[PDB]
Amino acid sequence: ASKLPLVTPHTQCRLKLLKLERIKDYLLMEEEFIRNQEQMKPLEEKQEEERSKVDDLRGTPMSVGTLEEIIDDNHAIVSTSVGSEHYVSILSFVDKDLLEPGCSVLLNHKVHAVIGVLMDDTDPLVTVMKVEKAPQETYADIGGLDNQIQEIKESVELPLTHPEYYEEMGIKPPKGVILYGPPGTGKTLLAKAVANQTSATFLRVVGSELIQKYLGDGPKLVRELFRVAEEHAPSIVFIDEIDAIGTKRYDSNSGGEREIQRTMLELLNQLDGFDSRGDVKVIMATNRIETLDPALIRPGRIDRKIEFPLPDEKTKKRIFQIHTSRMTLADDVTLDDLIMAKDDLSGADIKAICTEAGLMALRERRMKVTNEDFKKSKENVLYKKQEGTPEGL
């Protein structure tokens, strides 16, 4: 509560202890004196009747205007609802920490002098982007990464948990992490996990959702997205499928691609530009990364870059037992027989196989899922490969 900063080494030390013991001891003297005074006299009556004088000054028909410019000197220009513009005096009881242009101010009826402010809605965009807890699962449902999860934890979680480590040595955390790899490999899932596990406000956006059909709306959207992230303490932003917005930036192009490039420039400035980004982190994903712009994924914008390989032989077993976890299976399930094949299966492919097998098991009324069903489902899912066989090989 607006307490003093010790500004000793800030790391466990004897000076941090003595500057700390001192504030505690002063608070102790203050508390003792206050308790003595309260016992000696309640002062409830005196503290009261100040509310009465205030409410006397602010008449009953208080008017909700809209502040529009503070002259910096206990004066203001407050606009009444109709649209008129008055130049009123700011009184002494208004908490000035709450006065910024555009705030719904509470004016006097006969004199329009500012006498209070009101709260506003919390959903410019906060609700629509924040994801809350991930319905899928926690870190439990993710297996096989181990190293990647460790990287992300150090990049985004560890700087929140124990700042002392980074602080001790004078190095700030990395700026942003870009998750890149073949489709269906665990990018969005790991971001979801590090979101639902940490203690900041995690915001998610799709790149195609920044392609706007009015000019100068994409840049506005990105500017806002990075505007309500410093209003909210530590924050994380994850711009998924960025490829749809950040591309190689070929100049020989016509149409709305120019607007795409212009929003890309706005983002490129937000991440690392003139001003200090405050306390926010940026995660990104891209199935295809060779096509990003050099200035977006350059070192000071995205320090960490993470590859995401497919499950090889055993992570396949882990994922399979993760998705088959909740289903009654017959005692003939030759799971390895399904895994041993070097079919280059992907994680999303494993989920598809599990769901399809479960669904046909439901179709046949059978209380349990059989190995034959899983193999048939595997054949069916892989059926969505196509392409020209001899060609290219």
Binding site: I77, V82, G83, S84, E85, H86, Y87
Partner: protein, 48 residues
Amino acid sequence: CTKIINADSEDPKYIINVKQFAKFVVDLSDQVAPTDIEEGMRVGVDRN
């Protein structure tokens, strides 16, 4: 608040346009000197 639009004659006589209220032809109270007011500058006027 009112937005001066014209300052006619050397004699002080000012056409101001109060936003969404009306448009008048008013004079200078004693506090402001004639040099302070120019065309196009927002000015404050009383309610009477």
